[PDB]
Amino acid sequence: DFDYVVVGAGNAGNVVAARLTEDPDVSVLVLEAGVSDENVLGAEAPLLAPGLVPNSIFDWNYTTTAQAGYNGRSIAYPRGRMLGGSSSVHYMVMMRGSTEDFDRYAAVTGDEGWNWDNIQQFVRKNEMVVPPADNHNTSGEFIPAVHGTNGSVSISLPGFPTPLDDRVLATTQEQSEEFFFNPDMGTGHPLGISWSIASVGNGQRSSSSTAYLRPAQSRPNLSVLINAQVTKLVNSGTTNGLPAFRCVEYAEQEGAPTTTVCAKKEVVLSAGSVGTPILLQLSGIGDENDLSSVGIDTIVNNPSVGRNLSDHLLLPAAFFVNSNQTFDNIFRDSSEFNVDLDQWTNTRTGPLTALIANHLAWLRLPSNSSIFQTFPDPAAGPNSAHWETIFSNQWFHPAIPRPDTGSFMSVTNALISPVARGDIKLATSNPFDKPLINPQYLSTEFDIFTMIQAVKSNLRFLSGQAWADFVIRPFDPRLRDPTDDAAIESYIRDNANTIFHPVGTASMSPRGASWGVVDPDLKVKGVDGLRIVDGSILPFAPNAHTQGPIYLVGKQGADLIKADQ
Numbered sequence: 096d097f098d099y100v101v102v103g104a105g106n107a108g109n110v111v112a113a114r115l116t117e118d119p120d121v122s123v124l125v126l127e128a129g130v131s132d133e134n135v136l137g138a139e140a141p142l143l144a145p146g147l148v149p150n151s152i153f154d155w156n157y158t159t160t161a162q163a164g165y166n167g168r169s170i171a172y173p174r175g176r177m178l179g180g181s182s183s184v185h186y187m188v189m190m191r192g193s194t195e196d197f198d199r200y201a202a203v204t205g206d207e208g209w210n211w212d213n214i215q216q217f218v219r220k221n222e223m224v225v226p227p228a229d230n231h232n233t234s235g236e237f238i239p240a241v242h243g244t245n246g247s248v249s250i251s252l253p254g255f256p257t258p259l260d261d262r263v264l265a266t267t268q269e270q271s272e273e274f275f276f277n278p279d280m281g282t283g284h285p286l287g288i289s290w291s292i293a294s295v296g297n298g299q300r301s302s303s304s305t306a307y308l309r310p311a312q313s314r315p316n317l318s319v320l321i322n323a324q325v326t327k328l329v330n331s332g333t334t335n336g337l338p339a340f341r342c343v344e345y346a347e348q349e350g351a352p353t354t355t356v357c358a359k360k361e362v363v364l365s366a367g368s369v370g371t372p373i374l375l376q377l378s379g380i381g382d383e384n385d386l387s388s389v390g391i392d393t394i395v396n397n398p399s400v401g402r403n404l405s406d407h408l409l410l411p412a413a414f415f416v417n418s419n420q421t422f423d424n425i426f427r428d429s430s431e432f433n434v435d436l437d438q439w440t441n442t443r444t445g446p447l448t449a450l451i452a453n454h455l456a457w458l459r460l461p462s463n464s465s466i467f468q469t470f471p472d473p474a475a476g477p478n479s480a481h482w483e484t485i486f487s488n489q490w491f492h493p494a495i496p497r498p499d500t501g502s503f504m505s506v507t508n509a510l511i512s513p514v515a516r517g518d519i520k521l522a523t524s525n526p527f528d529k530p531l532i533n534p535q536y537l538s539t540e541f542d543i544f545t546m547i548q549a550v551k552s553n554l555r556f557l558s559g560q561a562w563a564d565f566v567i568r569p570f571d572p573r574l575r576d577p578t579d580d581a582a583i584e585s586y587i588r589d590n591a592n593t594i595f596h597p598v599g600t601a602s603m604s605p606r607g608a609s610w611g612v613v614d615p616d617l618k619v620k621g622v623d624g625l626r627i628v629d630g631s632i633l634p635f636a637p638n639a640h641t642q643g644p645i646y647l648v649g650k651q652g653a654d655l656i657k658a659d660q
């Protein structure tokens with residue numbers, strides 16, 4: 096049998112599998128619930144990413160419970176269900192977080208190994224900078240010294256330019272008190288307006304399966320099974336005075352017979368922020384009251400399982416623009432799409448290599464904001480963000496289809512420092528039934544107050560000279576008057592959604608602490624022979640879209656595992 100098993104084949108799970116098998120005497124089995132990523136056009140051409148999920152064979156098809164903060168709406172909660180995990184369906188944007196995120200992870204676990212300086216070594220293992228598809232001069236768009244040159248994931252500057260780029264840059268000069276330029280987020284200082292960097296190499300997706308699992312596939316000590324959903328972690332004995340969890344049961348689908356396999360050393364859960372708590376609950380590790388309400392016997396009582404869920408909420412907003420160079424028609428006119436598909440297929444250049452956004456703004460509330468009279472600042476620290484703004488050359492909205500007429504740019508906000516916390520729980524003890532995902536969006540005065548300010552900021556930005564001949568009007572007339580707080584708040588609660596960055600449902604904490612699910616070396620508290628390496632362990636939302644930090648976790652976690660061999 097195998098030394099390790101390998102719970103999901105995702106953003107962090109593929110790092111662990113590929114790193115452990117560098118040593119030819121260590122065998123790993125990866126169990127992935129989903130299908131192959133191989134020759135899925137929508138997962139290779141960057142521009143086609145938004146279409147892949149939610150309603151599809153590549154998605155788990157999760158939704159949230161009804162949100163009172165969103166006037167009663169449930170929203171889709173997409174997750175990738177295939178080789179590469181969510182790294183095969185994401186928008187490829189790459190950044191690591193602020194220095195304050197990592198120093199706070201160190202301070203709260205007691206382990207200086209997490210921690211901005213000590214983590215930089217993994218950015219170098221993790222990434223290499225390669226040319227943008229259009230091969231433009233990237234001089235002054237990032238700082239080469241703070242990025243990798245030899246690591247596994249290919250990253251680059253935007254591969255196709257847009258009419259927004261020069262206007263964003265001119266706003267950073269016209270409006271520099273509020274919107275100054277940031278040369279590179281890799282400094283650990285996220286604030287300001289920076290050029291996007293994305294996990295794209297040679298005009299296509301660089302994902303965790305392309306970058307780690309595929310090169311490693313010729314190894315005889317690595318084994319990868321797809322269509323293999325783990326349905327139970329099995330309490331396999333008692334070792335080191337604790338219940339041991341080194342066996343798993345897996346099946347192809349509901350109703351099929353289950354296969355049992357064991358690890359000699361450890362089972363590694365890399366099922367992500369939704370997949371990991373629910374699997375623990377299904378195996379009897381979680382809140383005793385919740386488990387017995389659904390007919391499950393508790394083996395380890397730990398109420399932190401599935402709690403402390405943080406996410407970045409999303410606010411979308413489209414504006415009509417005077418332009419024929421937006422990406423909207425690629426999605427409406429088949430001739431145009433096919434001309435750009437041909438160029439992409441033959442040369443890996445043109446519109447299909449384009450990103451969701453070429454520029455990103457990371458922003459704070461004023462130091463004397465009235466909200467601070469009743470909330471302590473929820474930012475990771477004074478050099479970190481309250482919100483983000485993302486500028487796209489088309490219509491972008493997760494819940495409203497692109498209109499048939501009009502050219503658009505969109506201004507999407509993400510709330511980076513929420514006060515809200517939610518949970519993930521079981522509705523039933525059937526591993527094939529969907530979970531109850533309740534992020535509790537806009538359930539605090541800080542969260543709604545900040546999104547109102549975010550909209551006023553968006554409107555000062557679009558009112559600059561650079562936009563005068565370009566922006567015509569908002570798609571939604573509630574975005575016309577920046578002084579009308581009632582109209583703005585109505586807009587936010589009818590439109591806010593998610594930007595897909597859940598963390599925290601299996602939080603790491605100090606050894607012995609009375610909250611958290613894992614120790615700082617990522618071992619499950621109250622159990623022997625089980626380790627968690629994915630997004631679920633991060634105890635706070637970072638200053639980053641979450642592939643960047645999650646790859647660092649995948650990287651320290653592989654080392655943490657080797658250190659106990």
Ligand SMILES: Cc1cc2nc3c(=O)[nH]c(=O)nc-3n(C[C@H](O)[C@H](O)[C@H](O)COP(=O)(O)OP(=O)(O)OC[C@H]3O[C@@H](n4cnc5c(N)ncnc54)[C@H](O)[C@@H]3O)c2cc1C
Pocket residue numbers: 102103104105106107108126127128129148173174175176177178179180181182184185186187188189190323324325326365366367368370371374594595596597628629630631639640641642643645
């Ligand atoms: C539409 C969307 C857009 C996004 N946009 C971006 C972006 O631009 N940039 C960015 O940085 N982040 C983005 N994200 C964030 C990022 O993709 C995730 O935060 C991160 O990749 C997840 O890392 P992971 O290793 O925790 O989980 P995953 O990559 O989700 O992997 C978990 C794996 O576990 C498998 N699994 C789950 N349960 C089981 C089981 N019981 N048995 C077997 N297999 C199982 C899943 O099928 C999956 O393959 C996006 C995500 C989505 C859904």
